[PDB]
Amino acid sequence: AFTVTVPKDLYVVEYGSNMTIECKFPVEKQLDLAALIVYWEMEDKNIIQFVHGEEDLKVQHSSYRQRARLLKDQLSLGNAALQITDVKLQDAGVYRCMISYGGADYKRITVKVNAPYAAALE
Amino acid sequence: AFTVTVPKDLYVVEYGSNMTIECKFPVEKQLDLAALIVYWEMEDKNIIQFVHGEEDLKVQHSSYRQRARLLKDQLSLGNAALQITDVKLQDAGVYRCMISYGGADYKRITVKVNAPYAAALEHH
Numbered sequence A: 001a002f003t004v005t006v007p008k009d010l011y012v013v014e015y016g017s018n019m020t021i022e023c024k025f026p027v028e029k030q031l032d033l034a035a036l037i038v039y040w041e042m043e044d045k046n047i048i049q050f051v052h053g054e055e056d057l058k059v060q061h062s063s064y065r066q067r068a069r070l071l072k073d074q075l076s077l078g079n080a081a082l083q084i085t086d087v088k089l090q091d092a093g094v095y096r097c098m099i100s101y102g103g104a105d106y107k108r109i110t111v112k113v114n115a116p117y118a119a120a121l122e
Numbered sequence B: 001a002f003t004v005t006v007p008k009d010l011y012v013v014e015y016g017s018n019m020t021i022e023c024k025f026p027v028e029k030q031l032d033l034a035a036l037i038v039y040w041e042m043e044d045k046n047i048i049q050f051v052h053g054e055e056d057l058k059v060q061h062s063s064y065r066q067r068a069r070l071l072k073d074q075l076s077l078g079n080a081a082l083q084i085t086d087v088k089l090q091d092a093g094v095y096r097c098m099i100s101y102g103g104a105d106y107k108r109i110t111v112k113v114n115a116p117y118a119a120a121l122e123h124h
């Protein structure tokens, strides 16, 4: 039975650092990327749309331009891992990874950003 | 390209009534039940899961208990509509119809609920 699992449904991270958030899906043999769809989003806001072997960078929310990537080697292990670099306060909230690979499921991940006083300022 | 489509991405409904919320996907010649997943949910609460060829209520949020149906019958025709009965004020918000069938897509629908003062005065 196809499910997506997260080893951590919550991450606490420091402002400016990098994070990698992970969804696991079953891969028993050679990854068939023609059958694989990985979608990552924070709102509403798209971060990854990986259909049949490539990103659709076209549709990615501006706020994730070049700070966000899916580690494609990790995919072969059944690990859709989104790495975000240079973490901002705006990156805090609910993420969703949706994966389809002979089955379909998704999981929710919550990200908290701790920041020093200097950084938090409106 | 695989796309889920919604005729109406806004519904307005009266407290106490039933509502049917439409969502459509393309079928080829035959529906392969085994490759169709449908999830309906609202604000990250599962309303319904259709996996394999069965309605699956395993993660159903209690709020929706016994008030939600998707018609197996109509899946053949590319129709994945959700039927909510006895609409509450707490049913208002953003719904998502998520569908894997060969490809994968989801679309959002906003639901507004009108109610009279007695019902609004839930309140508490």
Ligand SMILES: Cc1c(COc2ccc(CN3CCCC[C@@H]3C(=O)O)cc2Br)cccc1-c1ccccc1
Pocket (backbone or CB within 6 Å): A037, A038, A039, A046, A049, A050, A051, A059, A098, A099, A100, A104, A105, A106, B037, B038, B039, B098, B099, B100, B104, B105, B106
């Ligand atoms: C819904 C889903 C997906 C959905 O993937 C997509 C969702 C939307 C979209 C649409 N996308 C949105 C941003 C703008 C560009 C583009 C468009 O509108 O043409 C693409 C994918 Br892939 C992927 C993997 C699994 C599931 C799934 C399906 C059923 C149950 C559990 C998960």
